Design a protein around this motif. Structure first.
Motif, PDB file in Angstrom:
ATOM      1  N   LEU A   1      49.373  18.146  69.410  1.00 27.40           N
ATOM      2  CA  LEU A   1      49.536  18.943  70.604  1.00 27.40           C
ATOM      3  C   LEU A   1      50.942  18.842  71.179  1.00 27.40           C
ATOM      4  O   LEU A   1      51.388  19.749  71.881  1.00 27.40           O
ATOM      5  N   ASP A   2      51.649  17.753  70.924  1.00 25.63           N
ATOM      6  CA  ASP A   2      52.983  17.681  71.485  1.00 25.63           C
ATOM      7  C   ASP A   2      53.982  18.543  70.736  1.00 25.63           C
ATOM      8  O   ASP A   2      55.108  18.660  71.204  1.00 25.63           O
TER       9      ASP A   2
ATOM     10  N   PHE B   1      38.192  14.071  72.233  1.00 31.31           N
ATOM     11  CA  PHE B   1      37.877  15.344  71.588  1.00 31.31           C
ATOM     12  C   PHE B   1      36.468  15.363  71.072  1.00 31.31           C
ATOM     13  O   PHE B   1      35.873  16.432  70.945  1.00 31.31           O
TER      14      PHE B   1
ATOM     15  N   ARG C   1      46.579  19.643  76.054  1.00 28.92           N
ATOM     16  CA  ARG C   1      46.973  18.405  76.680  1.00 28.92           C
ATOM     17  C   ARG C   1      46.043  18.079  77.832  1.00 28.92           C
ATOM     18  O   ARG C   1      45.694  16.918  78.048  1.00 28.92           O
TER      19      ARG C   1
ATOM     20  N   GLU D   1      43.030  10.595  71.667  1.00 35.96           N
ATOM     21  CA  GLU D   1      42.891  11.863  70.969  1.00 35.96           C
ATOM     22  C   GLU D   1      41.492  12.031  70.416  1.00 35.96           C
ATOM     23  O   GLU D   1      40.813  13.035  70.686  1.00 35.96           O
ATOM     24  N   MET D   2      41.090  11.099  69.536  1.00 33.56           N
ATOM     25  CA  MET D   2      39.795  11.218  68.876  1.00 33.56           C
ATOM     26  C   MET D   2      38.672  11.076  69.885  1.00 33.56           C
ATOM     27  O   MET D   2      37.707  11.863  69.895  1.00 33.56           O
TER      28      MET D   2
ATOM     29  N   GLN E   1      34.703   9.614  59.214  1.00 32.96           N
ATOM     30  CA  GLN E   1      35.196  10.428  60.329  1.00 32.96           C
ATOM     31  C   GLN E   1      36.489   9.849  60.912  1.00 32.96           C
ATOM     32  O   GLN E   1      37.510  10.556  61.070  1.00 32.96           O
ATOM     33  N   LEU E   2      36.507   8.542  61.149  1.00 39.76           N
ATOM     34  CA  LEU E   2      37.715   7.916  61.680  1.00 39.76           C
ATOM     35  C   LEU E   2      38.919   8.167  60.780  1.00 39.76           C
ATOM     36  O   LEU E   2      40.055   8.292  61.254  1.00 39.76           O
TER      37      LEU E   2
ATOM     38  N   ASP F   1      41.300  20.070  62.832  1.00 35.15           N
ATOM     39  CA  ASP F   1      41.064  19.699  64.229  1.00 35.15           C
ATOM     40  C   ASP F   1      41.735  18.365  64.521  1.00 35.15           C
ATOM     41  O   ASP F   1      42.529  18.279  65.473  1.00 35.15           O
TER      42      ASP F   1
ATOM     43  N   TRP G   1      41.011  11.043  61.670  1.00 36.74           N
ATOM     44  CA  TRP G   1      41.838  10.835  62.866  1.00 36.74           C
ATOM     45  C   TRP G   1      42.971   9.858  62.590  1.00 36.74           C
ATOM     46  O   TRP G   1      44.074  10.021  63.117  1.00 36.74           O
TER      47      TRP G   1
ATOM     48  N   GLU H   1      45.611  19.015  64.567  1.00 35.11           N
ATOM     49  CA  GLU H   1      45.956  19.906  65.666  1.00 35.11           C
ATOM     50  C   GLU H   1      45.928  19.164  66.989  1.00 35.11           C
ATOM     51  O   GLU H   1      46.871  19.263  67.801  1.00 35.11           O
ATOM     52  N   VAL H   2      44.847  18.392  67.224  1.00 37.71           N
ATOM     53  CA  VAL H   2      44.785  17.570  68.440  1.00 37.71           C
ATOM     54  C   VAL H   2      45.929  16.559  68.469  1.00 37.71           C
ATOM     55  O   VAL H   2      46.581  16.384  69.510  1.00 37.71           O
ATOM     56  N   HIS H   3      46.254  15.928  67.319  1.00 36.45           N
ATOM     57  CA  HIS H   3      47.349  14.958  67.373  1.00 36.45           C
ATOM     58  C   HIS H   3      48.705  15.639  67.469  1.00 36.45           C
ATOM     59  O   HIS H   3      49.678  15.022  67.916  1.00 36.45           O
TER      60      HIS H   3
ATOM     61  N   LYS I   1      41.410  22.068  72.914  1.00 45.02           N
ATOM     62  CA  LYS I   1      42.562  21.577  72.155  1.00 45.02           C
ATOM     63  C   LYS I   1      43.844  21.733  72.967  1.00 45.02           C
ATOM     64  O   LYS I   1      44.713  22.523  72.611  1.00 45.02           O
TER      65      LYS I   1
END
Lengths: 237, 300
Positions: free
Chosen positions: A117-118, B181, B169, B177-178, A75-76, A110, A79, A113-115, B167
Motif C-alpha cells: 500500500l505504500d 486484513f 491505509r 497488515e495480515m 496462509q502465513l 491480496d 504474508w 497488495e496490502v503490503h 485495501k
C-alpha cells in the motif's frame, strides 16, 4: 492486467519488473509419530524474486524459526512473502524499485497488495503462464545455500550467469525456463544432462556450466527431448 | 398524521410512498397522500409510464415542514417543494380531503416493516449524504453515483456515503497488515465506529439508507455501499453483542422486503455466502440466515 503469451515480450522492455514466486517459502517433510499420527517438520525455504531482464535474483532465505509457535503456516507464508518483498522494495533506491511485480500464484495478490500500500504506483499483477520457478531448489547452489542457513539471510545471484554477454534477455529467459521446466519434470535426467561431461565446469561465481554456444544448442535440444518424452509417459500419447 | 398534497398529476406515473405504490393515470385527479405516520423518515418516488428508466424520489420528514408535489413540465418530473405559508397549506390540504382526492397511507397496524427498515435513519444524516442544503427533503434517482464510484464526475449530484475500502491505509495498520486484513475489527470499531460514525446507530442508519436507495431506485452505488457495510461487520472478529443482534434484525427485514424478482442484481453472491457461512459472524445471523435459505437458496 494478467501476464500471458500475448504480452510476453513486455518482460524484456526497460520498465523494471520482478517475478515473485512463493512455492518454496514454506517447505515441510511429512512423517509418522510414535503414536502413529502424522506430523510435519518444516525445513528452510526461499522466496524467489527475479528480474527477468537482468537476471538479478534476490533469494530471501526463510529460516524455519520464522514458523515457531505460528498457526495456519501455509496462509502465513503468503504474508511473510509479501512482507519480505515489500521490505526488499523499500531497501532499493527509488530508481531501482520495480514498476511492476508479477506473482506467479494468484493467492499472493491480496497479501502483496496490502503490503505494498505504500507504493501505489507499483502494479501488482497475476500471470497465466505456468512458470517453472518451483524447480529453483533443483539448482544445487541455490538449494545448498538455503539448506545451510542458520538465520534469515538474503543472497544475491545472477540467474543467467554471464549469458547476457552473448544472448538477449528474451533468449536468456527462455533458456532458464526451459532448464527449470526440465528439472521440474524429471530432475534426475535433467541434472544428468547438465553434468555428464566432467570437462565442462561451473564457475565458482556461477550457477550453470560454462557451455560453449554450440554446447548450449545440444543441451537445449536434450532438455526439449526430455520434456516431450515425459509428457507421453504422463498421458500415454 | 401528516399530508403531502399534489398540485396535479399531468403524466401517467407509478407513485410510491415508502413500500406502497399506486398507478396514477395521465391527468387523473390525484391530489396527494394523507395519513402519513409522523415519526419516521419517508420517501415518495416515481416511475413514469413512458420511461421505466430513472426511478426517482424524495426523502422527507413531515416534522421538518409542509411539503407538496408539483409536476414541472420544463424539467419533466414531479418535484417536491416546501410551502412556507402554514395557513395556505392547511387550506389546500383540507380542501383536497373535503373533495376526497387523496390516498391514505395504507398502514396495517400490526405492521412494523417501515419502522424496522428505517429504525436508525435520520433526516439530518440523509442531508449530509445528499448535500443540497437549500431544501429540507432530498432527491435521489437511479443514476446517481457515489463519491467512491466518482474516484474510480459531478459532485453536486453525488451520494456522499462513507468510503469503505478493505485495501487502504485507513483499513490497515502498518505492521498489522495480515492481522487487520483478515480481522477488520480495528477498521470497524476504531476507525469507523469510534472515529467516523461515532456510534452504531449512525452506522446502521447509513446502512439502511443505502439499502433503501438500492431497493427503491436500483441505485447500484448504494447496493455496493450496503454490501460493504455488512461485510465490514461480518469480517470483524470483535463486534459488540448489541450490534450483532440488531444487524440480524435489520437484514432480516431488508431481505424480507426485497422484491423476489430482483434478488439477482441487489444481492452480491460473494458477500452473502461469506457473511452467512465463512465469516467470523456466520453463527450470529440466525434469522437472516434462515430467511435467506428458505427464500433464495439458489444464490447460496
Amino acid at each position: 492486467g494478467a501476464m500471458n503469451s500475448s504480452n510476453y515480450a513486455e518482460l524484456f522492455n526497460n520498465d523494471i519488473k520482478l517475478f515473485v514466486d512463493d512455492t518454496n517459502v514454506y517447505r515441510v517433510t511429512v512423517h509418522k509419530t510414535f503414536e502413529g499420527n502424522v506430523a510435519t517438520k518444516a525445513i528452510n525455504g526461499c522466496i524467489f524474486t527475479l528480474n527477468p531482464k537482468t537476471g538479478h535474483l534476490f533469494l530471501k532465505i526463510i529460516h524455519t524459526s520464522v514458523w515457531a509457535g505460528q498457526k495456519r503456516l501455509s496462509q502465513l507464508a503468503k504474508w511473510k512473502t509479501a512482507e519480505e518483498v515489500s521490505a526488499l522494495v523499500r531497501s532499493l533506491p527509488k530508481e531501482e524499485q520495480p514498476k511492476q511485480i508479477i506473482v506467479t500464484r494468484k493467492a499472493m495478490l491480496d497479501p502483496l497488495e496490502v503490503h505494498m500500500l505504500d507504493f501505489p504506483n507499483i502494479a501488482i499483477r497475476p500471470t497465466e503462464l505456468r512458470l517453472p520457478f518451483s524447480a529453483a531448489m533443483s539448482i544445487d547452489k541455490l538449494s545448498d545455500v538455503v539448506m545451510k542457513a542458520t538465520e534469515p539471510q538474503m543472497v544475491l545471484f545472477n540467474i543467467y550467469d554471464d549469458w547476457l554477454d552473448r544472448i538477449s534477455s528474451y533468449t536468456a529467459f527462455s533458456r532458464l525456463t526451459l532448464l527449470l521446466r526440465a528439472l521440474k519434470t524429471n530432475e534426475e535426467s535433467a541434472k544428468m544432462i547438465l553434468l555428464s561431461d566432467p570437462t565442462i565446469t561451473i564457475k565458482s561465481y556461477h550457477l550453470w556450466p560454462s557451455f560453449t554456444d554450440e554446447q548450449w544448442i545440444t543441451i537445449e535440444s536434450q532438455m526439449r527431448d526430455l520434456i516431450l518424452t515425459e509428457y507421453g509417459r504422463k498421458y500415454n500419447v | 398524521m401528516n399530508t403531502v398534497p399534489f398540485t396535479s398529476a399531468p403524466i401517467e406515473v407509478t407513485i410510491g410512498i415508502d413500500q406502497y405504490s399506486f398507478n396514477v393515470k395521465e391527468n387523473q385527479p390525484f391530489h396527494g397522500i394523507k395519513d402519513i405516520p409522523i415519526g419516521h423518515v419517508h420517501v415518495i418516488h416515481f416511475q413514469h409510464a413512458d420511461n421505466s428508466s430513472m426511478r426517482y424520489g424524495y426523502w422527507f420528514d413531515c416534522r421538518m415542514g409542509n411539503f407538496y408535489i408539483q409536476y414541472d413540465p420544463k424539467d419533466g418530473l414531479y418535484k417536491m417543494m416546501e410551502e412556507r405559508d402554514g395557513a395556505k397549506f392547511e387550506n389546500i390540504v383540507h380542501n383536497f380531503k373535503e373533495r376526497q382526492m387523496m390516498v391514505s397511507y395504507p398502514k396495517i397496524d400490526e405492521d412494523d416493516t417501515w419502522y424496522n427498515l428505517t429504525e436508525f435513519v435520520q433526516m439530518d444524516k440523509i442531508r449530509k449524504i445528499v448535500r443540497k442544503d437549500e431544501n429540507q427533503f432530498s432527491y435521489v434517482d437511479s443514476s446517481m453515483t457515489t463519491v467512491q464510484e466518482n474516484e474510480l464526475s459531478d459532485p453536486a449530484h453525488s451520494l456522499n456515503y462513507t468510503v469503505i475500502n478493505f485495501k487502504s491505509r485507513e483499513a490497515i495498520r502498518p505492521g498489522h497488515e495480515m492481522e487487520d486484513f483478515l480481522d477488520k475489527s480495528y477498521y470497524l470499531n476504531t476507525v469507523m465506529l469510534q472515529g467516523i460514525f461515532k456510534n452504531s446507530s449512525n452506522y446502521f442508519g447509513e446502512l439502511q439508507f443505502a439499502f433503501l436507495n438500492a431497493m427503491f431506485f436500483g441505485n447500484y452505488g448504494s447496493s455496493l455501499q450496503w454490501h460493504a457495510m455488512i461485510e465490514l461487520i461480518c469480517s470483524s472478529a470483535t463486534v459488540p453483542k448489541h450490534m450483532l443482534d440488531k444487524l440480524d434484525e435489520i437484514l432480516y427485514y431488508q431481505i424480507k422486503t426485497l422484491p423476489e424478482q430482483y434478488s439477482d442484481i441487489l444481492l452480491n453472491e460473494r458477500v452473502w455466502n461469506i457473511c452467512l457461512y465463512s465469516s467470523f459472524q456466520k453463527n450470529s445471523l440466525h434469522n437472516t440466515e434462515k430467511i435467506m435459505e428458505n427464500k433464495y437458496p439458489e444464490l447460496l
